Amino acid sequence: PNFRGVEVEKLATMKITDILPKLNARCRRRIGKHGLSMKHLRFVNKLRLRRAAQPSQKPKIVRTHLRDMIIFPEMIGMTVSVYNGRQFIPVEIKPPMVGRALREYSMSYKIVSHGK
Amino acid sequence: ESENPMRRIRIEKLVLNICIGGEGDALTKAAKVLQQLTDQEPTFSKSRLTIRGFGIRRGQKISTHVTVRGEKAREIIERGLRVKNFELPYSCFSTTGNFGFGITEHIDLGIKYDPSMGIYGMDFYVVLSRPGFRVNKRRAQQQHVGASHKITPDEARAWVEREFEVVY
Amino acid sequence: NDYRDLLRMFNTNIQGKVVLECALVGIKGIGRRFANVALKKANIDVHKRAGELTAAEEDALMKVLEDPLSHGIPAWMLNRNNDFESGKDMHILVNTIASTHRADLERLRKTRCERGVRHHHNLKVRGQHTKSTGRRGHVVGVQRKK
RNA sequence: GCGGCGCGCCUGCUACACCGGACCGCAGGCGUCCCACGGCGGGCUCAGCGAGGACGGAGACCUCCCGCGGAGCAGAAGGGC
Numbered sequence: 001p002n003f004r005g006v007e008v009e010k011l012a013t014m015k016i017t018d019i020l021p022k023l024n025a026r027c028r029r030r031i032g033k034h035g036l037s038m039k040h041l042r043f044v045n046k047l048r049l050r051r052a053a054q055p056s057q058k059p060k061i062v063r064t065h066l067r068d069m070i071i072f073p074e075m076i077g078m079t080v081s082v083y084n085g086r087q088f089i090p091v092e093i094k095p096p097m098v099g100r101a102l103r104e105y106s107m108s109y110k111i112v113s114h115g116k
Numbered sequence: 117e118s119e120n121p122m123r124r125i126r127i128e129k130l131v132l133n134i135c136i137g138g139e140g141d142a143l144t145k146a147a148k149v150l151q152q153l154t155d156q157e158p159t160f161s162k163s164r165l166t167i168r169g170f171g172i173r174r175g176q177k178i179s180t181h182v183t184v185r186g187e188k189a190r191e192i193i194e195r196g197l198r199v200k201n202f203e204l205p206y207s208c209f210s211t212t213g214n215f216g217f218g219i220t221e222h223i224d225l226g227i228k229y230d231p232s233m234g235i236y237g238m239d240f241y242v243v244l245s246r247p248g249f250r251v252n253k254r255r256a257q258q259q260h261v262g263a264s265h266k267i268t269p270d271e272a273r274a275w276v277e278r279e280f281e282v283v284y
Numbered sequence: 285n286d287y288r289d290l291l292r293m294f295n296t297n298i299q300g301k302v303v304l305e306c307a308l309v310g311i312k313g314i315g316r317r318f319a320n321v322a323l324k325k326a327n328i329d330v331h332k333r334a335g336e337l338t339a340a341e342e343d344a345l346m347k348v349l350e351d352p353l354s355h356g357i358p359a360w361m362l363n364r365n366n367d368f369e370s371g372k373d374m375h376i377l378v379n380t381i382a383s384t385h386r387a388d389l390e391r392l393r394k395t396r397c398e399r400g401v402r403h404h405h406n407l408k409v410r411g412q413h414t415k416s417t418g419r420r421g422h423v424v425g426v427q428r429k430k
Numbered sequence: 431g432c433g434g435c436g437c438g439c440c441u442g443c444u445a446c447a448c449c450g451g452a453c454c455g456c457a458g459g460c461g462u463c464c465c466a467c468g469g470c471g472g473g474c475u476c477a478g479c480g481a482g483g484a485c486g487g488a489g490a491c492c493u494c495c496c497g498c499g500g501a502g503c504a505g506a507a508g509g510g511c
Contacts, residue, residue: 004366004367004368005370005371006371022366022371024366094395099368104399105396106398107398109398111401112425112426112427113427114425114427115424115425129493131492132492133483133484133492133493134484135485135491135492163490163491164490164491165490167489167490169489170486170489172490172491178491179491181491181493207481208482208483210482210483210493210494210495211480211481211482211494211495212481212494214493214495215482215483216482216483216492216493217483217484218483218485228379229379229386230379231379238484239483239484239485239492240483241482241483241492241493242493252495255473260495269481269482
């Protein structure tokens with residue numbers, strides 16, 4: 001249940017910079033030698049300011065084409081569309097779930113149903 | 117404003133139940149899990165009748181149960197409330213003041229997960245008794261207990277709340 | 285020679301033939317991240333019968349495995365470098381390997397993901413070779429609920 | 431009349447409240463089975479009404495509670511426990 005040395009609430013309130021030092025290579029270099037794009041960066045402040053301003057049950061759950069943006073600890077607690085190549089997949093991010101791409105939790109494939 | 121001291125509530129006993137069809141040796145494997153926790157030999161209950169959905173065939177051992185009481189009862193049940201985050205569903209209390217909960221993982225109770233011992237889920241049920249209930253079980257003078265002295269579920273939820281500080 | 289066959293530790297029998305080194309990577313395999321980077325040396329003899337090894341040498345060996353960092357083994361040899369738990373670098377021993385595997389697989393199920401579906405459905409994960417390569421045994425995408 | 435066997439035997443009827451009462455009259459069985467399905471002593475309460483409890487639902491287990499027998503006693507049925 002505890003994630004990367006932080007309890008669920010601590011990591012939830014921890015900044016993106018805080019969880020970044022102890023993380024996987026792709027995650028560390030995502031911002032370490034790189035950063036984020038301006039489109040990717042804007043999307044963060046299109047749910048962030050909504051996740052922190054709940055007036056009741058969320059009326060947003062916005063549908064976003066952007067998919068492989070590594071999820072941020074703060075964005076935990078909300079459902080993101082994580083568009084697969086056709087239809088949006090509603091995804092609620094678990095606090096231990098953070099530290100990996102929103103791509104991993106979204107299914108664009110058929111599970112099985114063949115073998116004929 | 118004082119209840120008689122016999123009107124207190126005591127955990128008479130705790131039952132421990134598994135239902136591993138019969139498989140090839142699974143019931144024996146659960147015997148190991150029960151033996152360490154209760155320090156007692158679990159007795160193998162038996163299947164009644166033969167059914168299609170499960171593999172019981174009127175003679176396959178289908179379940180293992182041990183009844184634990186006193187100091188052991190408190191600790192084994194306290195384990196069960198911590199692992200159930202001090203939360204229990206409200207309807208679990210029954211008509212005779214008996215309540216139960218479910219325990220995923222024989223390992224979650226602090227037993228080490230083993231390749232040799234596969235995870236076996238068990239379930240619990242704790243029987244609450246008001247001192248003076250012997251009138252129902254003694255070989256001589258066996259007569260039913262009176263209405264007041266029987267634990268009503270509302271009174272027992274209060275004893276569970278007082279005993280473990282649980283919430284529903 | 286007091287070869288002393290068996291000398292089992294960690295609930296895993298060893299041999300009077302195995303050299304002191306293969307004896308740990310051969311402790312069920314599970315329980316020893318090997319390549320013998322530190323195993324080759326440790327404090328134990330390089331090439332002798334593994335039963336002959338004295339208990340005191342075995343006990344010091346048990347201690348080096350118990351605290352790898354104290355021995356001076358670099359973190360890269362150890363398996364769990366960052367930990368998704370309390371985030372503390374740790375070695376894996378025999379029982380914890382399959383407990384941690386449950387931790388890795390059951391976490392996968394609770395945090396539903398393509399990497400979990402590619403394990404609950406038993407499809408090989410990552411390779412995407414469930415197309416024309418592994419007729420082998422029938423561990424391939426089949427299906428037939430109705 | 432050999433199509434049936436009431437040609438030996440048993441249960442419940444028919445049977446007309448002691449008993450005895452007919453019929454190719456009805457509703458059925460018997461020709462076996464079991465050294466435990468026997469004898470005895472001890473313990474025990476059963477089918478189930480509920481109300482609860484990982485998976486677990488018509489349904490499998492484990493709990494209490496109320497449980498006059500509503501259970502099972504090798505097979506016909508009727509007593510009996």
